[PDB]
Paper text:
AMPA glutamate receptors (AMPARs) are ion channel tetramers that mediate the majority of fast excitatory synaptic transmission. They are composed of four subunits (GluA1–GluA4); the GluA2 subunit dominates AMPAR function throughout the forebrain.
Residue numbers in the entry:
A (entry chain F), C (entry chain H): 5 to 42, 55 to 162, 173 to 214
B (entry chain E), D (entry chain G): 3 to 41, 55 to 162, 173 to 214
E (entry chain B), H (entry chain D): 508 to 551, 567 to 629, 784 to 825
F (entry chain A), G (entry chain C): 511 to 551, 567 to 631, 784 to 825
The structure:
Amino acid sequence: DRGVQMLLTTVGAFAAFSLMTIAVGTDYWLYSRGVCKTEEVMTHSGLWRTCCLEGNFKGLCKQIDHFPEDADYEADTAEYFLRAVRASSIFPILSVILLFMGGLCIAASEFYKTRHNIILSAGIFFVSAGLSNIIGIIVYISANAGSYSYGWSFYFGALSFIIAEMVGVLAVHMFIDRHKQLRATARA
Amino acid sequence: LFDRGVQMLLTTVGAFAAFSLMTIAVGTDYWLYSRGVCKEEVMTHSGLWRTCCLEGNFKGLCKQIDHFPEDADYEADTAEYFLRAVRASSIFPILSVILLFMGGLCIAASEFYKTRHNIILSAGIFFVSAGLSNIIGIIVYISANAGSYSYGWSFYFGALSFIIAEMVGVLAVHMFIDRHKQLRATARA
Amino acid sequence: DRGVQMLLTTVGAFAAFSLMTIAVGTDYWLYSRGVCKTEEVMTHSGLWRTCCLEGNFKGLCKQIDHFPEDADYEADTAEYFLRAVRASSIFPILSVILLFMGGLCIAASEFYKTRHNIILSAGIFFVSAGLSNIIGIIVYISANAGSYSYGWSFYFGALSFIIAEMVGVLAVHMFIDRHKQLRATARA
Amino acid sequence: LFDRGVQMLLTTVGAFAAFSLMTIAVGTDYWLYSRGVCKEEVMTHSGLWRTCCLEGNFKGLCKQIDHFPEDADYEADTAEYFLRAVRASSIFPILSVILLFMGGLCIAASEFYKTRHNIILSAGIFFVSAGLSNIIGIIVYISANAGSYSYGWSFYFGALSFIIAEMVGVLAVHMFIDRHKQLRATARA
Amino acid sequence: QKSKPGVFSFLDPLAYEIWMCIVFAYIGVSVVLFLVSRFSPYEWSTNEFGIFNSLWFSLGAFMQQGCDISPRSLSGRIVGGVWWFFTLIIISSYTANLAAFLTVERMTSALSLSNVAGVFYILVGGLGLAMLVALIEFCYKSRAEAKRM
Amino acid sequence: KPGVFSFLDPLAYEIWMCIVFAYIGVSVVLFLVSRFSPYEWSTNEFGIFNSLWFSLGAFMQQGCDISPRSLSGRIVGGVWWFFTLIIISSYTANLAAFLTVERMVSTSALSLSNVAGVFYILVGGLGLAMLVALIEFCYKSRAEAKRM
Amino acid sequence: KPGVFSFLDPLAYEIWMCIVFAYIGVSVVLFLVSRFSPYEWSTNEFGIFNSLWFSLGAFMQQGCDISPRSLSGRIVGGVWWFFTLIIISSYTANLAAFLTVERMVSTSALSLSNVAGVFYILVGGLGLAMLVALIEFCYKSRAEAKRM
Amino acid sequence: QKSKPGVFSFLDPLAYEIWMCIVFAYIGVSVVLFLVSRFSPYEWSTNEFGIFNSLWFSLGAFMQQGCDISPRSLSGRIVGGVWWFFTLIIISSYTANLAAFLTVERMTSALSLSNVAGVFYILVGGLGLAMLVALIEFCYKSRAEAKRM
């Protein structure tokens, strides 16, 4: 049913957008040890700040410094470029923006039924959001590399990518069905 | 492979042979020929529950297998404990025996009320699931063993049961195909 | 043309048979330092006898002992079986016999034109002769394993296998050609 | 890719550019940027025939490359001597230049007596062979060198010449295909 | 002392992050291939690259098991080529790291059944899941046919 | 003095036996999930003979003429592909470890004695195939005479 | 800190450059010997675009939709297959040597930092493919809209 | 001291006897496959396994490059299966021995062009040979065609 497809597409788009927005903003990206006030204590860290867990300074969040200029070392330019990419979180934010644009396209598609290219634009935006999510995950893990566990905030982004890809698949199906019906009418 | 009466007899005798082989395998203490104590390390032949001494000073003395030994077992992860429990219970070989028995029951009940074609399909499905469970049981048993040795005839009796069950299971589904082919043939004409 | 096919098949069968028979009986299978009748000097070794080269006892051949029972050792029975296979040279001789049988079948096929199974039998014999040549080569090299170079006798058998395989291809091609001609007659 | 007049101009300019780039690559001493003695050790830029000084005490002093050095060369097997002989002569770059020139001349002569379609095909094989010769020359040069460094613009001038020569070789056969397509199309009418 | 290898120890050569990213890349490649293969109405379907078929193609490409179908468009071929390069690199890295692990011991005999009992378990589980899915399909088709009649 | 069948050294005997059993099980399951349903009658060329061929081709990582198209058949194929990939990579890695460790123990190339077993198996398979083809031809020829 | 493109480490940069040139030359020669002869007109779908696809698939050792049928095209394919087999085996063996020698130097698993570059290349290729598909769609739509 | 590797040093991991027997095994398998595929008149062809196609299939099987055709009879499939097992074992052995060579030095850096220059030479020689064969075929057809007219 095309109505069921519409409902599933919009519900999944909103769910993926909400999950990924929570993932970007929240702080349960990674459980790791370290001082939360700049002693070794378990902490939970996100994309911007890390806060103490089960410690004397529990609850005190501290901004994450992505440029370790204590030794004033640069090494190669690739490391600096990766540091700049990770610090801005440009790819998770771009995934959020593209998911929002896909949702906007889906919402605006009902206003103009004749223009089928809006559904295609929504599908392209969703798939690009998934690709940006993949790039962001890769960049985040690579930056972390240079005992630990991943929290629900990180797994929220992982599940958000899957939902966005599934919604993009459904959106392209709607674009395919709309053009097939248009061709079917012309033959009749 | 041809006709229907000869296929039925071959499938029935194959199912019974597989059932007998697995019944012997699950109930015979000849699964592994390894050095061990059956009460100093000595040549013993082991099985699923008891191991008896071989060419020893007290031959033919069987003792239960220490599946959960005491005296500083050192413990292990939950996966190892689960594997040990599965091996001790022998759940997969026993489930294989059960599935062979119910497949044979379905085959026997197929003659009565021959209009029910789903009974033979059920027998084939049960035989295939029994073969899969036999694979799981053999894997679990060998993995627990590796936690100079040679395997006895009962272990190879169990090995033949899996082959026969899948062979018999193949034949049963062929009957289901041929029976439905006949239905399509008589429906068109 | 069928006549050219027959001529090529006969010429190749005779060439392969003669080359392989020369290989079996000659002594230039392998160049290796060794001893004649009992100093390590360069020798050329065949399949039954090893003869010294450019030494004090030059020109003298000595029979090869394929059972080194000096220390009275057997180890595994697989080694004994391999040595027995090497000592008897069962596979090179079998290749010779199969090549001879294929040649005889080819010669007798001209007597009975209707009986096309003789051509197929000749092709099967040639293919089996090539396979036996391969087994013999493998066994010979493996037995040698348990500085050296290979002589023209060994490479005579190697090229005999290639020709016999080529002749076997032509023999089968002739068999199908005759059967296709028979089917054409039935259609007409 | 479209029409014939634009195709002719594109093929001609590509062939001429490839020929110019390969001539520059052969005749310029900027192939490898490695430290070496161009007369102590100093930074030098080398080519196919002569290695020359850079930023040294006597800048611009250009000296011939020692392809078969004296003073206990230690010799080698036949393969290494053969490779050194090829590297010294640089025949494969020269063969590439010759084949590029032959292909360009064939392309130029294709306009004269346009009924001769095989001229464009001849140019196609000439350009493809010139690209293959460029590949062989590059491989031989690198293997001879390897037996910190960086490659100069003339080495990458020659690399572009091979790459261009293959599309120009690709275009020529497309023209040969289209010319035979035209013959078939008018033959039907 | 050397520990008894885990049931799922065949995943040891690669980190869990690599496996997770492999799954994500597989899903993304399948979706992109499906979209670039079938979105355009001017290509309608000339190819057979549905979402299920795209997933099958990507799975076959990763396991180096050939393909029943091959992309024919420029974009689909770009997708296939980058996925093939990725698969080559990843499989080679897995093999190389497994060889390194089996060569050097940190704190050589034949691989035992305990080293691959995991992959055997996933195989048997997949067989059972496939059988269950086929049985569900048969049961659904049987009930619907009687409903129609 | 390597054994004739020393190319099976990297994996244990139980692994090879379980490989044969798993191949048989996968082939049987593929046959069932391909042909058991009369509602699909068929649209796939996956018989018991063809299922074994597909499974063998997948284990050897060689080109397959056909692939399963249904969901269950594709699940079987996917799990078999994962199993095959892991097993082949494990064999190659363990062989590399064996050779590297032997190389560092206080000539270099592998000799024919290390693969003589695989050569013997190949030639035996060729002979068996020839025998099967000859038997099939003879049986058909006898049938042709009977019909005529 | 492994480099982003550290997966190319087992082979020298000259080897990669020569691999690119060899691929180009093999594809061009394939298109040559497949389509140059009007007497074969075609009976084979080996154009310039398809020859590049076949060469790429052969190098990646992945399933090929088509294979050359002529003697010269098959010679090209066979020599490319031999080259690809040797190159891929060399890559795997050198990577294994790198990892083993690093292991035996006085965590263990490969990290995402070791293979970040191949992931970046894959996502960039997906983006490029999408961009190309969108360009083609826009061109076709604008051409058809003006035509109608 | 470590000497410069030979041009054809990529054949080092396997002994020359192994390569010789590989060539003979390839020829024998091709011939046997052709024979079992086309000898029987009762199979007439249904399959495309001529001698040229059988050689192509065997070569593609050895190089792990798939196949455009597959044997369908029991005997042809037996031949294909044993050839596949042989190919898998041989390629794995080559890779393993090359890794062992590169790991342990007897009397690690990136592989240089000199290590694989021989395979490049063979590739270019094969390209030239194929080009020559194609040109010879075209020239022969050009002269033969004018003879008819």
